[PDB]
């Protein structure tokens, strides 16, 4: 897809936008790609994850949700309409976007259109609210209402599909086709008005079911099972781990670039024994002030070496001026970039790109000349 390496390398607009966002990567780019003649495809070859992260920072989108349910007022009442909320309204409700296209560039501005829509019966119908004839609505928006109903019909045109017999509730009532039992009472039936017509409370149920079905079906894009469903996984055997086991041999080779006999061993041990019997004079540990001088010189020299090394170890301050130090830093940076590209092409091991290795060697020679 678009996340493949060849797509990231050839996406010139994405590279331009990443340059526009970034500043520290600019100094590497501007002093090497054009000022030093490095090919642009070579520069972005080592920065593929950064390009992928910058692409995925904007390519991802939020999931669908009931955007009109979140829209509520707060005499003056104020409601805040974010641009993402407008996009979610357009995605969840194509009828509103259809009214947006033929009115906003033609007759009135976008906030006027949204204020007309929020005061119309279409917003109440799409929000699940019951429609009453006492409300004025908005005469411009309400022209779409019947068409919206057609859209609802067309919604069923891609929602109705055959289902499995496990959840086939249609076939359950059709299992007995000639059943003529007692009619269910009015508690088991949808509500009716005084004239017998429906009160419309069943339409909002179908409305929210249709909204849920549309949000589920929007996930189905490019972005024998009954036996598996009815099987009881608890009665089956527990899962057995197939993790690999390793036995490590410790027969390593010895490191490469006067054995005492047990008799003299025992004689030396017995010498230590009798030297421990008679007197362990601890005062014999005192040096004769000659070897102590050598020990002191050795220790002080080691201390001097270690202290001169560890006297000094955010970068540290430099004696160079800020003008020359930044020039040295940028020249070091472009030398390191050229060296990285040269080693990548050198250790890649592809003979077809050896001309690029030769060009990078010439660039490294030019960097030596610049140094």
């Amino acid at each position: 897809d678009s996340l493949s390496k060849e797509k990231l390398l050839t996406n010139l607009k994405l590279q331009q936008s990443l340059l526009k966002g970034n500043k520290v990567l600019m100094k590497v780019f501007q002093e090497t790609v054009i000022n030093a003649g490095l090919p642009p495809s070579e520069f972005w070859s080592t920065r593929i994850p950064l390009l992928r992260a910058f692409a995925l920072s904007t390519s991802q989108k939020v999931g669908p949700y009931n955007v009109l349910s979140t829209i509520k007022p707060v005499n003056k009442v104020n409601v805040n309409l974010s641009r993402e909320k407008i996009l979610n309204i357009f995605e969840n409700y194509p009828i509103v976007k259809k009214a947006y296209t033929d009115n906003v560039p033609k007759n009135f501005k976008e906030p006027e259109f949204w204020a007309r829509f929020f005061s119309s019966k279409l917003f109440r119908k799409l929000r699940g609210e019951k429609i009453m004839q006492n409300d004025r609505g908005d005469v411009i928006i309400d022209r779409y209402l019947t068409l919206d109903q057609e859209f609802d019909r067309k919604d069923d045109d891609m929602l109705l599909h055959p289902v499995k017999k496990i959840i086939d509730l249609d076939g359950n009532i059709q299992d007995d086709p000639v059943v003529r039992g007692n009619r269910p009472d009015f508690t088991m039936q949808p509500g009716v008005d005084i004239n017998g017509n429906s009160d419309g409370t069943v339409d909002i149920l179908k409305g929210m079911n249709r909204l849920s079905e549309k949000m589920i079906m929007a996930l189905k894009n490019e972005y024998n099972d009954e036996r598996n469903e009815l099987k009881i996984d608890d009665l089956n055997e527990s899962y057995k781990t197939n993790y690999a086991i390793i036995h490590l041999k410790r027969n390593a080779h010895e490191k490469t670039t006067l054995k005492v006999s047990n008799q003299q061993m025992l004689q030396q041990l017995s010498l230590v024994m009798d030297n421990l019997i008679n007197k362990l004079d601890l005062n014999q540990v005192v040096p004769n002030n000659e070897v102590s001088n050598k020990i002191n010189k050795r220790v002080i020299t080691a201390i001097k070496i270690n202290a001169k090394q560890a006297k000094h170890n955010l970068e540290v301050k430099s004696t160079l001026p800020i003008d020359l130090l930044e020039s040295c830093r940028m020249l070091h940076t472009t030398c390191c970039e050229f060296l990285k590209h040269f080693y990548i092409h050198f250790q890649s091991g592809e003979q077809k790109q050896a001309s690029t290795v030769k060009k990078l060697y010439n660039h490294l020679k030019d960097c030596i000349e610049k140094l």
Binding site: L12, Q16, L19, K20, M26, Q30, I34, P40
Partner: peptide
């Protein structure tokens, strides 16, 4: 001041767009 710096980056954007196209 960074305003002259970002102006130079904008000029460099124009130069790079002219050269690459």
């Amino acid at each position: 001041e960074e305003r002259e710096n970002e102006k130079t980056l904008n000029d460099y954007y124009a130069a790079l767009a002219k050269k690459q196209a």
